[PDB]
Design a protein around this nucleic acid. Structure first.
Lengths: 50, 49, 52, 174, 126
RNA sequence: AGCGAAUGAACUUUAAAUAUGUAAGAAGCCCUUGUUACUUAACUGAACGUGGGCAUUCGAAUGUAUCGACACUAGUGGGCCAUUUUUGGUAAGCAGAACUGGCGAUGCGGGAUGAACCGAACGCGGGGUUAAGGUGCCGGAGUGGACGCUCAUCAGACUGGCGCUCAAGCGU
């Protein structure tokens, strides 16, 4: 239960942190380039033939 | 992340509800489904899960 | 003997995640944004947008 | 190509110790989503200034919404089409309410008349003919003429395609 | 150049001397020496066929064979790994030993000041 | 790309794309010292004897329902098609090399029959969703929507037949 507390708050504050950084960098004559994705999901969608 | 992802069996997904693009054996940039779709993959996941 | 979807069965979700009841009770999925007057977009950004 | 959107893609070389603070190249790309916009931006910066996706990054990708999409206006678009013979430069006029709509019509027109693809068209520039008489296409000049008014004869009535049999023969005066 | 028996040797094959030349499948390859003569040198080189590997023993003389620079990374890596592990044990701090596969980039901001973006078009007309 | 650097594809600060060999610690590392049947002017190297410390990133990633050796036992030695790279000739086809994938030994959905090619590879069933291909009728599913073009005295069909023309044709 306590770990779920911390995890949900962690998710919401990273979302708001990215949004706030983008907004303030847009205001101060800059361009905040988001961090590149560390996680990818790969789906094989073609058959196992040729 | 090695052990957490290796512990999970590969996800056996269903076919997408709503189908693929009309020519899915072509890159996503050229109006297909192959390659990197980035965040749009969420929609594909929402169709296949 | 029978796998039950936690997204459909609320008891299975409460078994796996005890926080689901107070996540739904305290409305942490409908959280509101920070209050106060938001500032306006800088003119430099607008002149960069509609350039030649 | 679908719901095209005008994207402001700013991109720059990767910063190095020898060459810090790059030039921040910016381009306007009409693409259905952001991934196509970024790819076309690199396709163009590979062509022009010789920077690459592996040695570069995207500074920003912003939607450029039309300022007044409730006002009909005249657009003049310059474009380069690689044909079987070779590359040719053209210029076409369109009466649309938004730059996006003009580019969508352009793509439909060059697909219908010249059989041109998305990958075989390079939109040089899209301008608005603010002043009257700037339009040179006779069809567009007909629409810009004084006090236009035309009737709609032989209007096919929208009947249901699942209404198979009709008792009364229809009329085309509506 | 002097060559031992059991050293990793790469061959490049020039066209200066046509005596004892190997085929273009062996052009620019790498192998292990098992035989040294007055002029020629016997090298084992691996070969692909369908699903498997066959070792082949070939003879090239001196002017096309040279000691390879593939292994010195191993010796430099073991030397630095030993030395920073010695410093880590002396100073009592943890230090990083392996090779990292170069994680993607983090977040940063770029200033519009003194770096005003330029607008471009598919063709560079000037 | 530059040569507002030198020099001149053979120019180069930088550097593609594209494929292919080798190495990624414990069967390991480094250095110091004796011996040897070897080697060289000579530990110049090689091998046999040295020592040290590293098992809590033990020295990238990912996978790992495992691999090596020894011994024993059946059936087989066709060719064809396609791709990538390369050489030569002909009026044009074509001829010579390596490469993988398949067929022989393969059923199913499409493909107008086949075959090639596209999808996808097979226990017996129920439900759901798709791939390739389609939605005028035969034939399950749109006489669906937006923009233009075409009337052809045997048009055209991502046509088989009927047939179709602000399409049931073509491009998006």
């Amino acid at each position: 239960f306590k770990r779920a507390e911390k995890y949900v708050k962690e998710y919401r504050e990273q979302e708001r942190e990215k949004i706030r950084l983008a907004r303030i960098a847009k205001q101060q004559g800059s361009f905040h380039i988001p961090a590149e994705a560390k996680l990818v999901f790969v789906i094989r969608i073609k058959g196992i033939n040729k | 992340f090695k052990q957490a992802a290796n512990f999970l069996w590969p996800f056996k997904l269903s076919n997408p509800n709503g189908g693929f693009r009309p020519r899915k054996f072509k890159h996503f940039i050229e109006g297909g489904d192959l390659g990197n779709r980035e965040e749009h993959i969420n929609a594909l996941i929402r169709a296949m899960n | 003997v029978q796998k039950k979807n936690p997204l459909r069965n609320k008891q299975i979700m409460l078994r796996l995640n005890p926080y689901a009841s107070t996540f739904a009770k305290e409305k942490l999925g409908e959280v509101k944004a920070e209050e106060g007057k938001p500032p306006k977009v800088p003119a430099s950004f607008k002149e960069l947008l509609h350039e030649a | 190509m679908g719901r095209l959107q005008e994207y402001q893609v700013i991109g720059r070389h990767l910063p190095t110790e020898a060459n810090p603070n790059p030039a921040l190249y910016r381009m306007r790309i009409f693409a259905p989503n952001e991934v196509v916009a970024k790819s076309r931006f690199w396709y163009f910066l590979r062509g022009l200034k010789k920077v690459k996706k592996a040695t570069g990054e995207i500074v920003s990708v912003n939607v450029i919404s039309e300022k007044h999409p409730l006002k009909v206006k005249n657009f003049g678009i310059w474009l380069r089409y690689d044909s079987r013979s070779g590359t040719h430069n053209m210029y076409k006029e369109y009466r649309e309410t938004s730059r996006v709509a003009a580019v969508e019509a352009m793509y439909a027109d060059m697909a219908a008349r010249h059989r041109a693809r998305f990958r075989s068209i390079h939109i040089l520039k899209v301008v608005e003919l603010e002043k009257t008489e700037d339009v040179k296409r006779p069809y567009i000049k007909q629409l810009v003429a004084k006090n236009l008014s035309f009737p709609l004869p032989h209007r096919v009535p929208k009947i249901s395609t699942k209404k198979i049999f009709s008792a009364k023969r229809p009329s085309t005066f509506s | 150049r002097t060559y031992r028996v059991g050293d990793i040797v790469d061959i490049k094959v020039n066209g200066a001397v046509q005596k004892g030349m190997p085929h273009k499948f062996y052009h620019g390859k790498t192998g292990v020496v098992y035989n040294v003569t007055k002029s020629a040198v016997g090298v084992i080189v691996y070969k692909r066929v369908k699903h498997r590997y066959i070792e082949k023993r070939i003879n090239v003389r001196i002017e096309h064979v040279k000691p390879s620079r593939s292994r010195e990374d191993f010796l430099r890596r073991v030397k630095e790994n030993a030395e920073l592990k010695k410093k880590a044990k002396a100073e009592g701090v943890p230090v990083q030993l392996k090779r990292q596969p170069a994680m993607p980039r983090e977040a940063h901001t770029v200033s519009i000041a003194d770096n005003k973006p330029v607008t471009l078009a598919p063709v560079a007309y000037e």
